[PDB]
């Protein structure tokens, strides 16, 4: 469904759209009033379309058939459509400007005009900023739409989110297929998982989210930090974080690569550990330095602590927890004795690591504020034993 909305959605990716002219050649030509085209949602990959059953919607490419998905930009609602323009080679005249032209979107076949539905009862009571978009014969003055540029970084991020979501959902589906089915003394007999693609995507995304070097000059480093924060926020809003968590859970159900192999096979078992480590690293990269993304774990902190004992990705899980604790006071407030004891047990079981001490230190104080309960719990649990 399509809505008019205001707020952070303007910064977000899901408000992004791509214009695709029908002609393949010179598709990058200057847009022209009355030019038929298709409107694609970058992240989902879906195309704006008119469907008899649900009117204005976004549909898949397979369903798109150039009559539902064909739209044109019109300077004025008055419609003559006496002569269709001829196909033109080259870039052509620069008719439509960014941020200046007022454009009405018209569905070519029906001739209907894109417009807001108008509030349904109790919507005005809520005051919600969402106004469903419809195709209507008359519409209103206000229907005119400005077109605004999108940064290359953000467009690339939207496309990357589309591809990553598709790949990771396919991977999750492959896992769920044999979740409860042991292959036995035989193959799993299901579609091969995309292990190499997942590994490469994780590596590329980690490099994508890598923080700027400390040796870097201050202004450039600040610019990189901004870009990184915006990119983290976009991925989070489109839900890649939750997808990573789901993949991690599906992989965690299996204790070891052999236990994984009994369900998926050795050829995936070798990459199991690499994939879990890469997933934890990607999670840490996404949430590192991001207050909101680190705060999200207030709802599920047990998700991180429960997994600390696991050997395969101990360091990655610990880094994730360290990032969360440095960033989010909320987590500190919701800490409990069970979590503190689990971390102390991590010291006992995995040896003397100063990173655990740094985690404990972060628990005590955040941004000039001390948590007395956490301080006292750490003291009472760790110190008196003296071992």
């Amino acid at each position: 469904l399509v809505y008019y909305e205001g707020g952070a959605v303007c910064t977000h990716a899901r408000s992004l759209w791509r214009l695709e002219p029908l002609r393949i050649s010179w598709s990058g030509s200057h847009l022209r009033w009355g030019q038929p085209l298709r409107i694609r949602h970058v992240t989902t990959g879906r195309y704006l379309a008119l469907t008899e059953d649900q009117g204005l919607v976004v549909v898949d490419a397979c369903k798109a058939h150039t009559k539902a998905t064909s739209f044109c930009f019109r300077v004025s609602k008055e419609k003559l459509d006496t002569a269709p323009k001829r196909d033109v080679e080259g870039m052509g005249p620069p008719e439509i400007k960014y941020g200046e032209s007022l454009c009405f979107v018209q569905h070519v076949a029906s001739g209907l005009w894109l417009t807001y539905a108008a509030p349904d009862p109790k919507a005005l009571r809520l005051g919600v900023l969402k106004k469903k978009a419809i195709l209507h014969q008359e519409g209103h003055m206000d229907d005119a739409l400005f077109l605004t540029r999108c940064q290359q970084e953000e467009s690339q991020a939207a496309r990357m989110i589309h591809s990553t979501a598709g790949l990771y959902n396919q991977f999750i589906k492959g896992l769920d297929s044999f979740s409860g089915k042991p292959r036995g003394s035989g193959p799993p007999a299901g579609p091969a998982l995309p292990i190499e693609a997942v590994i490469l995507s994780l590596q590329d995304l980690i490099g994508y989210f890598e923080p700027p070097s400390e040796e870097l000059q201050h202004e450039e480093k600040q610019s990189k930090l901004r870009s990184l924060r915006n990119r983290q926020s976009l991925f989070q809003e489109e839900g890649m974080l939750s997808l990573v968590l789901n993949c991690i859970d599906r992989l965690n159900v299996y204790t070891t690569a052999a236990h994984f192999a009994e369900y998926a096979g050795e050829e995936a078992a070798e990459s199991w550990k690499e994939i879990v480590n890469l997933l934890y690293e990607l999670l840490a990269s996404l949430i590192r330095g991001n207050r909101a993304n680190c705060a999200l774990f207030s709802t599920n902190l047990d998700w991180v602590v429960s997994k600390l004992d696991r050997l395969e990705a101990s360091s990655g899980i610990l880094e994730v927890l360290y990032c969360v604790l440095i960033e989010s006071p909320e987590v500190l407030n919701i800490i409990q004795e069970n979590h503190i004891k689990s971390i102390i047990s991590l010291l006992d079981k995995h040896g003397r690591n100063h990173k655990v001490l740094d985690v404990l230190c972060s628990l005590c104080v955040c941004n000039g504020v001390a948590v007395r309960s956490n301080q006292d719990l750490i003291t009472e649990n760790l110190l008196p034993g003296r071992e």
Binding site: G99, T148, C150, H218
Partner: protein
């Protein structure tokens, strides 16, 4: 009440001492003038022994003033949700702004000499990144009015006074190479915040002054509150004077940059924003004139409020004039297609009627003169 007003000798000692503290502070310390800005700037500008090393010429290490400018630019560039107030930045910006200007017939020789001295004093700053720091702080404020942005604007005006082409070029080059929308977004937000005459606030202040209740502490008759009507007039004049100075000298490049920013993903038209503020001010002035229309004689507070409004409108007119002068044809066309005509119509109406009214009473001659100069 006066009988109860005790002679100070009856007053307890500690209360009297505190009263003496406030009185001495106001009468003596504030009245005392001490100028350390020029000396401080010279001391910081001087770099010592670098010629003695003779490698410092190849190295070009910053001088102390350059380092301070770099520190403030670092603070501005630092990524933050909000710009925290820095009394240090405020004080140092005041010091530099003072140093630059450091201000009945004058010879051409003399005028040229003062121009040259001001250019040197401005060079002390803009050779050391002061212009870039000013732009960075305006971008950092993100449209929130404050003492920080006031000091930044004052510094910019101080370095730009006389239409310094070199400062203009530095600012424009920095903006074009950075390609950041935050600067003009902040300017637009600041204009939107800039206030106009409010008849309700004027009436409330009049009621308060009329009451003039005695304060329980001591006695304060007719107590006065901070000016409600157009309190940010100094900030408004500073902002529009900064914008004017940027285009001063018929700098077509910066004029066209204000109209549109080609490289940037989004564009803001400062000329149209100025026109909108002028229209709002004109509406306020028209309403306030209507309020005083039946009344035979405007009172003193009304005269002061008119004077503030007309000074602001004068600065706005000068800024628009400076945008279009040179001439800049694009700015001319934009204004021709803007609402400036409606603003001029309202201003002419107010001018005519207030002229006729003010002519009637001689005490209103100064306000009439200001009105005529505004026309």
């Amino acid at each position: 009440a006066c009988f109860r007003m005790t002679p100070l000798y009856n007053l307890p000692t500690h209360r009297a001492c505190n009263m003496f503290l406030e009185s001495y502070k106001a009468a003596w310390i504030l009245t005392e003038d001490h100028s350390f800005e020029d000396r401080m700037i010279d001391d910081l500008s001087k770099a010592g022994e670098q010629e003695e090393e003779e490698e410092e010429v190849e190295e070009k290490k910053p001088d102390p003033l350059h380092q301070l400018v770099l520190h403030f630019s670092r603070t501005a560039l630092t990524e933050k949700s909000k710009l925290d107030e820095d009394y240090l930045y405020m004080a140092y910006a005041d010091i530099m702004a003072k140093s630059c200007h450091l201000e009945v017939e004058v010879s051409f020789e003399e005028k040229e000499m003062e121009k040259q001295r001001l250019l040197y004093q401005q060079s002390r700053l803009h050779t050391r990144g002061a212009a870039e720091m000013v732009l960075q702080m305006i971008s950092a404020c993100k449209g929130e009015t404050g003492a920080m942005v006031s000091s930044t604007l004052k510094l910019g005006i101080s370095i730009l006074n006389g239409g310094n082409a070199e400062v203009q070029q530095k600012m424009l080059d920095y903006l074009k190479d950075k390609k950041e929308v935050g600067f003009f977004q902040s300017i637009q937000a600041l204009m939107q915040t800039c206030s106009v005459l409010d008849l309700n606030a004027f009436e409330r202040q009049n009621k308060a002054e009329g009451l003039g209740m005695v304060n329980e502490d001591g006695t304060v008759i007719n107590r006065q509150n901070g000016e409600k009507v157009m309190a940010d007039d100094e900030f408004t004049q500073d902002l529009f004077r900064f914008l004017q100075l940027l285009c001063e000298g018929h700098n077509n490049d910066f004029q066209n940059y204000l109209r549109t920013q080609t490289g940037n993903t989004t564009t803001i038209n400062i000329i149209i924003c100025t026109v909108d503020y002028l229209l709002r001010l004109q509406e306020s002035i028209s309403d306030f004139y209507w309020y005083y229309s039946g009344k035979d004689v405007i009172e003193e507070q009304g005269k002061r409020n008119f004077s503030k409004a007309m000074s602001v409108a004068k600065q706005v007119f000068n800024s628009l004039t400076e945008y279009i002068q040179g001439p800049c044809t694009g700015n001319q066309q934009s204004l021709a297609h803007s609402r400036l005509w409606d603003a001029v119509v309202g201003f002419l109406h107010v001018f005519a009627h207030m002229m006729m009214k003010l002519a009637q009473d001689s005490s209103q001659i100064e306000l009439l003169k200001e009105l005529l100069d505004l026309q």
